[PDB]
Design a protein around this ligand. Structure first.
Ligand SMILES: Nc1nc2c(ncn2[C@@H]2O[C@H](COP(=O)(O)OP(=O)(O)OP(=O)(O)O)[C@@H](O)[C@H]2O)c(=O)[nH]1
Ligand SMILES: C[C@H]1O[C@@H](n2cnc3c(N)ncnc32)[C@H](O)[C@@H]1O
Ligand code: MET
Ligand code: MET
Ligand code: SF4
Ligand code: SF4
Ligand code: SF4
Ligand code: SF4
Lengths: 326, 327
């Protein structure tokens, strides 16, 4: 079994398929920085689907059961159905997932289910049209996205929602969001907002802890804990007593998870990272695969890359706060 | 004055083992099979002297240690333990000195201990039923006796907390009469997940009552408020009886390991250094190092080097393995 320096297997491949997006959320792609000026990667510098297939295959032979398609907005990638179809004919890969803001689901959703997509996570940082429009900067109403989700549901897709909660900004949205997806039978998850200050420590200001979210919810709903599907399961799950619908609370900052992190990522221009955090550029997979290589030689470079992985960034920020508190 | 190890962690706690002897033969710790009639314990001369301990603790204080815990073995078996407490009480920088004990010997030694400056003790007590407890400790000690020792301890001015290790099938039906009994005494009881490494080799969850599991028996018999934490990445998750305001704790060692915030150094009873509770190999021989003749400053350089190369994270390795084992 292939394992990093901390003893973790490879089980997940996060696959970035584009640097582009039809939103300008300010945590993520603020307009100052990603303006009309901006030059996103030209066509021929993204990986072809057939290179993504070769990489996903070789990864499946080293452990990866699961693939997550991101960007960017992944739906901004043209002919995404083709990738989903290619990846879904690889036999070690059990589940394929796609993280979207959802806007393009009515346009491309059917061609993607046809191709083998059964499951999507829709980000949606707010349900009130005014606040959400002021988060996304592209004049798109939370209502629009609540209708793409319902069409995704209707074509047969399994939909889950990712909400990043921020104190002053995204706080008052927890309760109307729960109550909405409760009669919609969709599984919603509220994620702690992540942020690091000057002193390498955590930024607990805008962060509303799993402790604090539940104290709020348990006042407006009757709530039951659900024992973890598997062991080392990221999100914590609870259930509503009347209709047994579930919601999740991911504890990013107040409860780090680096020890069971099994996720390898490829960025939109074909670089390897062992962590959603990275100061330096990583191995240039693209320059490697285009210099001519054998599958079973691609297999050794990824394996060499994983075995030398020792990433633990949310752990380090955790170890720095204890160091700063001193 | 702040020293960090390979994984970013500062040194803060020193665990001092003062003896390899115990008056109990607990099955998960010292079973009679292994520690029987013929087990040779350490000769006197091969224990650290109280002067040696006082000197180690002084130099660790300079490296940022604030907290000493005295353990064993059963520490109350080490003769003249009050001498040690007195010397440690004289070390600047050391804020908290604690004792972990089975509590059998508190009436015997407690006053002399208090006299010398001890104020805080944790008492291990795995059951409150007498028959079950005899069969846990294997030396015919009733739980009633330990409860009498606990009450004497509080009466002379010691702060008592209680530590309970829960194995499913054994003492898991002790969770509610122990919660209740100590709620009434205004005593802080903490419940610890049983640590057992299977085959294999990730955790063995057989027995093993989780946090959730444990907190579901509790929520049915008592009416509970969760407590916000003292400090970032704090040991237990605390809770509060609404009555009343008594606290209990839930130490989640297997379901959620705390290695990334682990701040403890240990000296064993044979005077070896360990960076972790677990340990497959012999530690640096600190006792032979001191007895070779070294200055304080040479002792310091060594503790410091010993801390900077530290990368122990035993429980997180097991957790990682437990993930890897599923596949
Ligand atoms: N894995 C691990 N468990 C620990 C560690 N320190 C304490 N524990 C657990 O906590 C239990 C009781 O701890 P004690 O030695 O009495 O002291 P403490 O609770 O850590 O410290 P206090 O806050 O002073 O009460 C032990 O039985 C341990 O299993 C540690 O460093 N690592
Ligand atoms: C000290 O060490 C603790 N102790 C000893 N062995 C274990 C174990 N396997 N798991 C958890 N705690 C243990 C007991 O609580 C005693 O208080
Ligand atoms: C870096 S986030 C990319 C996925 C998607 N555009 C979302 O945020 O919902
Ligand atoms: C390994 S525990 C050592 C301290 C004490 N004898 C215990 O039983 O509380
Ligand atoms: S939608 Fe997703 S990718 Fe686009 S900017 Fe907002 S968060 Fe980022
Ligand atoms: S910081 Fe990196 S290593 Fe830790 S979980 Fe986040 S992704 Fe994994
Ligand atoms: S009393 Fe303490 S040291 Fe003695 S066997 Fe039991 S747990 Fe271990
Ligand atoms: S396993 Fe070792 S490193 Fe981890 S917390 Fe326990 S003592 Fe610290």
């Amino acid at each position: 079994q292939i394992k990093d320096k901390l003893g973790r297997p490879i089980r997940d491949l996060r696959l970035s398929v584009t640097d582009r997006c039809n939103f300008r959320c300010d945590y993520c792609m603020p307009k100052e920085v990603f303006g009309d000026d901006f030059v996103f990667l030209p066509k021929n510098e993204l990986l072809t689907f057939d290179e993504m297939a070769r990489i996903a295959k070789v990864y499946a032979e080293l452990g990866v059961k699961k693939i997550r398609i991101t960007g960017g907005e992944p739906l901004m990638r043209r002919d995404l159905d083709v990738l989903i179809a290619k990846l879904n004919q690889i036999d070690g890969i059990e589940d394929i997932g796609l993280t979207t803001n959802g806007l393009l689901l009515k346009k491309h959703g059917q061609k993607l289910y046809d191709a083998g997509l059964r499951r999507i996570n829709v980000s949606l940082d707010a349900i009130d049209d005014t606040l959400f429009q002021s988060i996304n900067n592209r004049n798109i109403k939370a209502t629009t996205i609540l209708e793409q989700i319902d069409y995704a549901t209707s074509i047969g897709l399994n939909v889950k929602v990712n909400v990043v909660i921020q104190k002053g900004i995204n706080d008052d949205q927890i309760i109307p969001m729960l109550e909405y997806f409760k009669d919609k039978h969709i599984e919603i998850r509220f994620i702690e907002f992540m942020d690091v200050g000057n002193d390498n420590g955590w930024d607990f200001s805008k962060v509303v802890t799993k402790d604090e979210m539940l104290t709020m919810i348990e006042q407006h709903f009757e709530i039951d804990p659900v024992e973890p599907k598997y062991f080392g399961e990221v999100a914590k799950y609870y259930r509503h007593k009347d209709n047994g619908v579930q919601f999740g609370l991911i504890t990013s900052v107040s409860q780090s998870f680096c020890s069971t992190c099994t996720r390898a990522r490829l960025s939109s221009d074909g670089k390897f990272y062992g962590c959603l955090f990275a100061t330096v550029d990583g191995f240039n997979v693209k320059a490697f695969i285009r210099s001519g290589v054998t599958d079973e030689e691609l297999k050794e470079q990824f394996k060499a890359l994983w075995q030398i992985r020792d990433d633990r960034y949310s752990d380090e920020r955790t170890a720095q706060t204890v160091a700063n508190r001193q």
